[PDB]
Structures are given as structure tokens and as C-alpha cells.
């Protein structure tokens, strides 16, 4: 089976160059076309370009011609994407993708279309520095309560409720990017009003890059 | 460059219903080199169909591709719960490969008006010199909804941000949260903080408000 494993997420300064790697195993590396496809947050897929390693033949989308380089290292079965002169609009998940084969194993006739995908690499173009969030309560028929996880960088944060015991009615919203360049995230849950005096609600917030691990009790 | 048009960009369909998704090319796609991909939030795309109609092993045969030239169709014979996702077409009949902008297939359910909640800034936050006011629009359907902030009846602009959950896997609703941000000093200049909500399920706008300090 073909497996594509990409390098980890990276924050890059505006104007810098990013290199993303894609290490392949299984099937043939040299004789099948490897492409790069990106997806900006909340947007569609965009094909950037590709390489056929055996022939050292690249093929770039005109939109990226002059700003990207795709290379392949046969000794390590690794393909590389270079993207230069980075701007905020280059913030995206970058995927490597290899064409599929017919059959009948993984050495058959190529199909052109992308059967095999890496797990993606989040490239965040930003001037911000790592920062842990503050965690503020959203204090409470049906009552709503929650936590506001404000001013962190980079992504992601994770939020659970009551150490994972509470999931019904929990909504954890997508992060928003503030004018400061820092993210903010809200998580809420609805519960019976009658439960407020008797049951405890604690939001468990984890921001690994800052080692911020906060368990915030939310009360009336 | 071949432009691929996927219209509509969203389809609201019932569990078990048939789905037909269109992909129209601005010019003939060479050798029917047209593929369809599925993508769920947080996951890589997955190949469903290549060469307009060929299905990789492992892909469910309720997915079928058809068409030629400029006119392509993805048919899902019967929507299973996992089939509600985004679908992209892609042409690779020219060295410049392009994708359609995608069609989100989402679950149609009965209309549900948002349940609206407003949250004043916490004492903790106010101590730090900033005020975040949060409005929650909970468990509504369909997805289209609007929130407006009013501060002492003055319509706010430019000082709020919002985001929306993915469709709930269990009850097929959406929720939306909006945050109004002011300095503590500016927050303390005003009394009434209100969020006004519009939605198909509401005959008239819903306003939730509080008076600062009370």
C-alpha cells in the first residue's frame, strides 16, 4: 500500500520561503506523478504543480510559475515543495498527492487522478509569536454556558468539558483570527437550568505550544 | 485554462435521497479526464471517480460518474449518513489541472429558529482591560443567519467576529457565535449591549440584551 507522510505544521514569516516534504513508501516512487494541492482555510482545492521523479520533469500551474519549486529525491523517496515570497493568503493546508494505479497491486497502469494523499501540512504565514490563551467564563428551561479561549498563537487549541464526560450539546466553534494576529475560540454547552445549582461545569483547555493547560470552572 | 463550474455550491438533501451533482467545463475535457473527490472536515480529499466514470476498488458503488465533453455528473444513488460532505470535480485533460469550487451536500431537516444567548464580559477579563461580549445562536436550521450588534442602539461595524459550527451529526443543526470586542474604557462608556438576530425560522428579529453592570 502507498503511504505519503508529510512534514509537520510550520509558522512562516511574511516574505519567507517554506519547504514542505512528502516521504513515500510502497509502490514505485520514480515512475508515478506526484502533485501538490493546497487548501486555504474554508476554501476549495487548488492544484499547484507536480513532478515525475524519473524524468525530472515538473509542471507548475501558471499562478505559481516563478514562485514554486518541486523536487524529488529518489534516494529517500521524498518529494519537496518550495513556495517563496510568502503572503497571508498562502496560509493553507498543503497536500502531496500521488496518482493512482489500476489493478491489482500498486504497480499497475497509472490513472492520472490522485488516489493517494498525504495527511497535509498547515503552513501559517504570520508575524505573530507563540502565546498562551486566557480562558474566560461565559456564565449561564435551558441554560447556555461556555468558555472564551482568547488570544493564542499558533493553532490549535482543544477544549473538552468535565474531562470528556460532557459532550452532549457541546459546540466548540472554529477559531477566529483577530486583527492582532492572535486566535480566539469559543466553546459552549447547553444544559438544563435546574442543573446549575447542583452540577459543576468545567472547560478543559489545552494549548500545547504554550503549555497552557487550564481547567476553568464556569459558574453563575 | 479550463474552468469547472459546480452549481449549486450547496445541496440540502434528506437521508436516503438520490443526489446528482453537476460539473460543467468551459471547454471539452480531453479524453474524459475528469475526477471526483470527497472531503470531510479535517480530512484529506478522497478519490471517488476517475476518467469520468471509473470507480477505484474500495469506493462504494452507490457513487457513479457519468458524462463526457463539457457535461459531467456525480450521482449518489442513496445518501448514507457519511455521504454528507463536500465533493470536488477535477479535470486533468490539460497540463494545467483545475478543480471545481466544490459542492457541499448537507442534511435537510425541519426549520429550527436559533435560540439566542448573550454573555457580558467576565470580571476576570475586565481586570485585564478588554471587554469581549459574546452572542450565541444555538441549534438552528437552515444555515443562513445574521447577527447585528447594537450598543445604546448604535449599530456596530468592524468590531465583531463570528464563526459557525459544522452541521451537527446528531440533530443536523448549526450554531453560530459572535464576539464584540471593545477596550474596557470604551465598554464602560455605554449601557445597553444587544445582539439582534434574523433567521428564516423567525417571523421578526430576536434581540437579546443586557445593561452593563446590572
Amino acid at each position: 500500500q502507498v503511504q505519503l507522510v508529510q512534514s509537520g505544521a510550520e509558522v512562516k514569516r511574511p516574505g519567507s520561503s517554506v519547504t514542505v516534504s512528502c516521504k513515500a513508501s510502497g509502490g514505485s516512487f520514480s515512475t508515478y506523478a506526484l502533485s501538490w494541492v493546497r487548501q486555504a482555510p474554508g476554501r476549495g482545492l487548488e492544484w499547484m504543480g507536480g513532478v515525475i521523479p524519473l524524468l525530472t520533469i515538473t509542471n507548475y500551474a501558471p499562478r505559481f510559475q516563478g514562485r514554486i519549486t518541486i523536487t524529488a529525491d529518489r534516494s529517500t523517496s521524498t518529494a519537496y515543495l518550495e513556495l517563496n515570497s510568502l503572503r497571508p493568503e498562502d496560509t493553507a493546508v498543503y497536500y502531496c498527492a500521488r496518482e493512482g494505479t489500476t489493478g491489482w497491486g500498486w504497480l499497475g497502469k497509472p490513472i492520472g487522478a490522485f488516489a493517494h494523499w498525504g495527511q497535509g501540512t498547515l503552513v501559517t504565514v504570520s508575524s505573530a509569536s507563540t502565546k498562551g490563551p486566557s480562558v474566560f467564563p461565559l456564565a449561564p428551561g435551558t441554560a447556555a454556558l461556555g468558555c472564551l479561549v482568547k488570544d493564542y498563537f499558533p493553532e490549535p487549541v482543544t477544549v473538552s468539558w468535565n474531562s470528556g464526560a460532557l459532550t452532549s450539546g457541546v459546540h466548540t466553534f472554529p477559531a477566529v483570527l483577530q486583527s492582532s494576529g492572535l486566535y480566539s475560540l469559543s466553546s459552549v454547552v447547553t444544559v438544563p437550568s435546574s442543573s446549575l445549582g447542583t452540577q459543576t461545569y468545567i472547560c478543559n483547555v489545552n494549548h500545547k505550544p504554550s503549555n497552557t493547560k487550564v481547567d476553568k470552572k464556569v459558574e453563575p | 485554462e479550463i474552468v469547472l463550474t459546480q452549481s449549486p455550491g450547496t445541496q440540502s438533501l434528506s437521508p436516503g435521497e438520490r443526489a446528482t451533482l453537476s460539473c460543467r467545463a468551459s471547454q471539452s475535457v480531453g479524453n474524459n479526464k475528469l475526477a471526483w473527490y470527497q472531503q470531510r472536515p479535517g480530512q484529506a480529499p478522497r478519490l471517488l471517480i476517475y476518467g469520468a466514470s471509473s470507480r477505484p476498488s474500495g469506493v462504494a458503488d452507490r457513487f457513479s460518474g457519468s458524462g463526457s465533453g463539457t457535461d459531467f455528473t456525480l450521482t449518489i444513488s442513496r445518501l448514507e449518513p457519511e455521504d454528507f460532505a463536500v465533493y470536488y470535480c477535477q479535470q486533468y485533460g490539460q497540463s494545467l489541472s483545475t478543480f471545481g469550487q466544490g459542492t457541499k451536500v448537507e442534511v435537510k431537516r425541519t426549520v429550527a429558529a436559533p435560540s439566542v444567548f448573550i454573555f457580558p464580559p467576565s470580571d476576570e477579563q475586565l481586570k485585564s482591560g478588554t471587554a469581549s461580549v459574546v452572542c450565541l445562536l444555538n441549534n438552528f436550521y437552515p444555515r443562513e443567519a445574521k447577527v447585528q450588534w447594537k450598543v445604546d442602539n448604535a449599530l456596530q461595524s468592524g468590531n465583531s467576529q463570528e464563526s459557525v459550527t459544522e452541521q451537527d451529526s446528531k440533530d443536523s443543526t448549526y450554531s453560530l457565535s459572535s464576539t464584540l470586542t471593545l477596550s474596557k474604557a470604551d465598554y464602560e462608556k455605554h449601557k445597553v449591549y444587544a445582539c439582534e438576530v434574523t433567521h428564516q425560522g423567525l417571523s421578526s428579529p430576536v434581540t437579546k440584551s443586557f445593561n452593563r453592570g446590572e
Binding site: 515512475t31 508515478y32 506523478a33 507536480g50 515525475i52 524519473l54 524524468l55 520533469i57 509542471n59 496518482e99 499497475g108 497502469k109 497509472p110 492520472g112 | 480531453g30 479526464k33 486533468y92 485533460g93 490539460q94 497540463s95 489541472s97
Partner: peptide, 14 residues
Amino acid sequence: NWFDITNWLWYIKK
């Protein structure tokens, strides 16, 4: 079509 190259390679290797 760059996309056709690997099919040709596959063929001539066979």
C-alpha cells in the same frame, strides 16, 4: 499533456 507521461513510461517499460 504532462498527465499522460507516466502512462507512456509504464507502457514502454512493459
